[PDB]
Design a protein around this ligand. Structure first.
Ligand SMILES: [Zn+2]
Length: 205
């Protein structure tokens, strides 16, 4: 197992996307002892919804000891992402290939005129860093078109919005836009960017 590819997952709240990430992707990585870092921006006072999947790294001991990491991003900042990314590259030096999971990728990967060096590395040199990416977002146009060009896999849950379908067809795949509107609840469509193939998946157990 060497997960250094880029997966984008698109789905609204309650689409079932959270279950796919938290009850499939993260547990599979843990099971195969693949390290990961989760970037979470959801300030709940009960704390991160990802707290059971990893540790908040604070001390020197944490730095060398904690393979599964949760980061609370209060900043949602380009300054923050450079630290997160530079940190992840070193995390992979320590633990081997690692996966950076971004819970609401809009904050870092939304449209910007001047794309920061780290974001550029994330999208164009991720396999050199040994960092796979899972970018989660609610709506397809939340993210720069370049993200979908650079992705290996694009996972989509049902959407009705005409704005979304036309965006999908324009920037990703017309066939995907056609089949996404046919998805039953919790079903998800997977577009493989490298094979140009679309598969519909049944809901996770
Ligand atoms: Zn963040």
């Amino acid at each position: 197992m060497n997960p250094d590819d880029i997966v984008v997952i698109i789905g609204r709240k309650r689409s079932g996307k959270s279950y796919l990430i938290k009850h499939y992707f993260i547990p599979v990585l843990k099971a195969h002892k693949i390290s990961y870092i989760i970037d979470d921006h959801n300030l709940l006072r009960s704390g991160s919804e990802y707290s059971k999947f990893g540790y908040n790294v604070v001390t020197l001991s944490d730095i060398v000891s904690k393979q599964y990491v949760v980061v609370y991003d209060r900043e949602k900042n380009d300054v923050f992402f450079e630290k997160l990314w530079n940190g992840a590259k070193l995390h992979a030096k320590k633990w081997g290939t690692s996966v950076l999971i971004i819970d609401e990728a809009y904050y870092h990967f939304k449209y910007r005129q001047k794309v920061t060096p780290a974001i550029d590395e994330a999208l164009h040199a991720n396999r050199h860093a040994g960092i796979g990416l899972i970018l989660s977002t609610q709506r397809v146009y939340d993210l720069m078109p370049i993200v979908y060009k650079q992705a290996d896999l694009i996972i989509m849950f049902y959407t009705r919005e005409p704005n979304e379908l036309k965006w999908i067809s324009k920037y990703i795949s017309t066939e995907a836009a056609e089949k996404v509107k046919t998805l039953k609840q919790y079903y998800f469509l997977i577009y493989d960017v490298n094979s140009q193939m679309i598969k519909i998946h049944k809901p996770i157990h």
